[PDB]
Design a protein around this ligand. Structure first.
Ligand SMILES: CC(=O)N[C@H]1[C@H](O[C@@H]2[C@H](O[C@]3(C(=O)O)C[C@H](O)[C@@H](NC(C)=O)[C@H]([C@H](O)[C@H](O)CO)O3)[C@@H](O)[C@H](O[C@H]3[C@H](O)[C@@H](O)[C@H](O)O[C@@H]3CO)O[C@@H]2CO)O[C@H](CO)[C@H](O)[C@@H]1O[C@@H]1O[C@H](CO)[C@H](O)[C@H](O)[C@H]1O
Ligand SMILES: CC(=O)N[C@H]1[C@H](O[C@@H]2[C@H](O[C@]3(C(=O)O)C[C@H](O)[C@@H](NC(C)=O)[C@H]([C@H](O)[C@H](O)CO)O3)[C@@H](O)[C@H](O)O[C@@H]2CO)O[C@H](CO)[C@H](O)[C@@H]1O[C@@H]1O[C@H](CO)[C@H](O)[C@H](O)[C@H]1O
Ligand SMILES: CC(=O)N[C@H]1[C@H](O[C@@H]2[C@H](O[C@]3(C(=O)O)C[C@H](O)[C@@H](NC(C)=O)[C@H]([C@H](O)[C@H](O)CO)O3)[C@@H](O)[C@H](O)O[C@@H]2CO)O[C@H](CO)[C@H](O)[C@@H]1O[C@@H]1O[C@H](CO)[C@H](O)[C@H](O)[C@H]1O
Ligand code: K
Ligand code: K
Ligand code: K
Ligand code: K
Ligand code: K
Ligand code: K
Ligand code: K
Ligand code: K
Ligand code: K
Ligand code: K
Lengths: 258, 257, 256, 258, 257
């Protein structure tokens, strides 16, 4: 596509506003937003995580007003993690930090990630341990070899289904994704404190170095997210991932292309 | 509402200067600024916190000079009041080691403030949907398991002081177009408070179109939470500790149609 | 009414000085330290000794006699003696067997201000039943409301080694003729992070281009630099503070 | 070299996109991306690490389109660590952080480093311990003396081979490297949390203070990297370095020289 | 001097490139870059550190081309050399836990550098005025209890290498107008070193008037400290570990009156 002028006028702009719920595993009817308690395999060879123990990428495909050549161009993003103050519940079946103390709050490894694109997020598969057996009902790197622990170019995929692509074995493919803007931070360590900021005054500009945002193929906007905030420790010491929803507001304009 | 010109002239500006006290629970006549000591339920379904154990949002509705003109909030200076109180490490706390000073206030903090031309709009989200919030608090009603991530039924206005518990409400990012809000949750049992003070910092409240919050009915709404962390008693029991927040807001008269 | 700045060689002056810390100085050998910290047996019985309480430092500096008033325009400031915290061999508490001594660490408060009059203070107490000791100036008639905000507790930082750090802060409702800056970093294991350089200048002008205007040709400097606590071999702990350098540039301003 | 004007026209620019795999030691056929478990000598003098326990620098020499005097000038870099979310696998033969807890995640000492130049990265040898015996199959500071613990100007080398130059005994030589741009961070400490950021929106400009980027001698571009993320702790407590691959995208333009 | 114009043209600029080795104590023929193991006095009064246990400031005086014109230092690039040595966690250190790797170098650090047209000016400050500093070091003389906070008698020049202990001297902020200095003390026994390297970062040495350090007698003075932390031996004994610092300074000729 050769990119030409922006359309102007009342009709030329539109907005998407929505939220993506986290997909942490949801091990039972009371534990939406949590994973199953984490168990550790006896050996590398025997690593076989159950689906409800594996956080997955969230994705939404948002239909835009039909245009047809014009395409919707995503220009700005406001985004926020929803429910940050829930982590102040340190009185609910947790593990006391010391005798008579409050419960240990959610903490430890986090991944906060979001993207806005004009097509599905492109994924590259990378595994901690290539002998991990990923479970039925997930989509994972197939024919994994030892080289998959560092880089195996066979593992290419699209983030095209919710509750399906486990976080731990996929990343945005930096060799593609030219029509998407993605941003993420993995903060490791078992004791790391969550640090969650909220404001309605911050905008991210989605334009590239040529002044062009993601262009929405087939008039669909793709939003993706992961917000694994840390782990919740219950009184037994067992730990579960806890996630939160992410708010998106995207402003778009119509752009002519050839 | 179409927004038109700003008014000028000596008459056209005003300032609001005040403080909001923290609402940490205040379990007895001696414990203003603290919560009740925190206990832990044996199961999710038995989580039933006492009201005096729950920090709540602070809010103040400030009447402005009667005025279509509307007062437009343009700048904010804000500060946490009494930061140095956290240097009292001698008041029946828990020695960090034999012969040592008391463990200082630390752990989970939430520092939040907002300035708007109407009540802060809230979205309820719960850690655990089977938590029973107590009498005298206002809380997400008809909670379901979906309320643990997002249930759009839980909409409210921060319209009452010491009533909305911090842990089950956040600013609603889907609304709040006429408010500016800012907050940080810093988690962890051992996180050190880091509290900055200065009278030289100003936050501009104008949006991307140059328009600040417009005060409906000539009222300015200020909201805050400043849970600084937990105080650990000698016994090991822990209480939230909060501090007041100073606000100075400058406003100008704006014509609307 | 602030009018024009005077120019010419004669129109500027500089103040350069240091403020020593006032940590309690429990004996003739312990300048810069507090008395070891004890913990009350009950919350109600909190009663810290004077020599256990760090206090605000203040200096009033006379300026050249001058309507014109000296206007403070810039500040350079620095903590003096940051490397002393590398002494980990002076009867401290070994971090483990055969190890060096635990360094100074823990709760710190670093604060400085420059004004044309005394810093204005607001009293706030951690515990309203704390008995503050004879020889200190503290919030009088404290009530439970003093734990969060009691507007009765107003004061001027007008005396050195007197106003305890823990029960006073800069009053944000006043201080229009002062510029102040402070950070409390709390936690028993927090590391000191102390930067020094002679290349960084703070501008003291407000949003209208006006710096503090020095009433009576006096400049007021205040500081706190509680760096953390030193832990003795026995486990007892003392606050340790350090001196602060100030360099302030001033210019003559006409006022009506 | 006198540097003259930049060529223009559609023909005057090119891009290199690739990835460099980590070289952590690879102790067996299942442990690509890991080192051998780390052991400790019994005396300072007897330090003698095995080759498979020593992470090494990665390097790639990338042939560029033939010129000829024109040279390719490297102007911009996008780079990213690939597979950051692998660190979320805390269920694979690790050491529980407490009773019933999840596995301790990868953490501890990290070195993240990358460079782009018009010739091989120039190295200076520095050793923690001059009496360390570096193993056969590595290239290490020769004839080390006590002065080599701080600075011995004899130890000059070029990063010209993979799986050869151990990270711990070489650094970029700050006294040379004028035709290279390098960037690195050592974060030391056994419990340091990894903090890994990903985005496709960040570009580094490689131009120096005269507006000139690395000039590619012989039409070769040199990319180097190290991404030791931390250590993985096994059930028994033994620890292995864990590394990840690094993506590079470099934009180049033709520059006339005399 | 009145500072006049910069000279232009051929031979109006020059560069200095060098490195300064650390002076950590060097307790034997094998331990260049380390201190003697750190011992703790039995009483506060009896503090008496051995010379080889005390890191010292590094200094180099670099002769410039002979020139009134004076060489004016305009820019600096600097780097710590050998940052990756801290990845040696296999050399008779102390395992962090059963079967683990050795504890890496960590804890209290001081990273400092200056560039000036004359010797760095020092002010003495002591942690403990009853500390007996050892023969062969240059230290605050006639120390009194006031020396624990500020005693203006302790003035010195950093005019000798491996002589001025780091712990009892700092740059004198009341002087040093013809030097630019930068440092950071990071304290705590477990602080992680964070060491950045790049050849793309330049510091400009010009003051607010556009004037860099002017080199009296055509000599440039470079000073450094890079105590990276402590190495913990298998036995638990600890030694300071330091690294060399690279300097590249660009200078120009300046006429003065
Ligand atoms: C364990 C011990 O005796 N330490 C004392 C030390 O002895 C020297 C050797 O010990 C180490 C160490 O301190 O652990 C071994 C390390 O690998 C060395 N590390 C490096 C990087 O060199 C350090 C280091 O050289 C010094 O600490 C630097 O000052 O030394 C010890 O193994 C050796 O033992 C000899 C023994 O003397 C001899 O009779 C026997 O036949 O063979 C043994 C093995 O060769 O002796 C070394 C001294 O020659 O020496 C230092 C001197 O500074 C101290 O005396 C240290 O004692 C500890 O000091 C602590 C204070 O930091 C604390 O007070 C402890 O209570 C002391 O035990
Ligand atoms: C030790 C004890 O019995 N704690 C009770 C508490 O009894 C209080 C007094 O205890 C203390 C405390 O918790 O250690 C003493 C402390 O100095 C006080 N601190 C302040 C700043 O006031 C606190 C504080 O007032 C309360 O915790 C606020 O809720 O109280 C005790 O010494 C005295 O004999 O009796 C007093 C009567 O109340 O009462 C609390 C009422 O909420 C609790 O019942 C507390 O029980 C402990 O609670 C822990 C969880 O928070 C845990 O479950 C322990 O097992 C339980 O003993
Ligand atoms: C161990 C002891 O008896 N501590 C007393 C103290 O006695 C001091 C001397 O003790 C020390 C110390 O506290 O360890 C020794 C240390 O090297 C000194 N450090 C410095 C930098 O000078 C300190 C220091 O001078 C004081 O703590 C300052 O207040 O003192 C002791 O070795 C000597 O035999 O006698 C000395 C007194 O003449 O006196 C203190 C007076 O405040 C306390 O009474 C201290 O007792 C401890 O107090 C702690 C908090 O107050 C804590 O509660 C302990 O449980 C308690 O034993
Ligand atoms: K398997
Ligand atoms: K690409
Ligand atoms: K309940
Ligand atoms: K909205
Ligand atoms: K009392
Ligand atoms: K005021
Ligand atoms: K050896
Ligand atoms: K060079
Ligand atoms: K002595
Ligand atoms: K001076």
């Amino acid at each position: 596509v050769e990119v030409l002028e922006v359309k102007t006028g009342v009709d030329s702009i539109t907005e998407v506003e929505c939220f993506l719920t986290p997909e942490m595993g949801d091990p039972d009817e009371h534990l939406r937003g949590f994973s199953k308690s984490i168990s550790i395999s006896d050996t590398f060879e025997s690593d076989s995580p159950n689906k409800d123990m594996l956080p997955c990428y969230s994705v939404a495909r948002i239909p835009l007003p039909n245009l047809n050549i014009l395409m919707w161009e995503a220009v700005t993003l406001k985004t926020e993690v929803i429910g940050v103050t829930t982590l102040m519940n340190v009185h609910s079946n947790g593990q006391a930090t010391h005798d008579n103390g409050a419960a240990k709050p959610v903490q430890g490894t986090s991944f906060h990630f979001f993207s806005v694109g004009g097509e599905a997020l492109e994924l590259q598969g990378v595994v901690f341990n290539y002998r991990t057996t990923y479970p039925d009902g997930t989509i994972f790197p197939k024919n994994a070899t030892v080289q998959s622990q560092v880089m195996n170019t066979e593992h290419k995929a699209y983030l095209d289904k919710n509750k399906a692509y486990p976080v731990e074995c996929w990343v945005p493919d930096p060799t593609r994704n030219e029509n998407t803007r993605y941003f993420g931070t993995l903060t490791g360590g078992e004791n790391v404190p969550p640090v969650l900021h909220i404001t309605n005054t911050a905008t991210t500009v989605l334009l590239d170095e040529f002044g062009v945002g993601p262009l929405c193929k087939g008039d669909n906007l793709y939003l993706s997210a992961v917000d694994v905030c840390g782990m919740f420790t219950n009184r037994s010491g067992s730990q579960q991932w806890r996630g939160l929803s992410r708010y998106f507001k995207v402003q778009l304009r119509k752009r002519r292309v050839k």
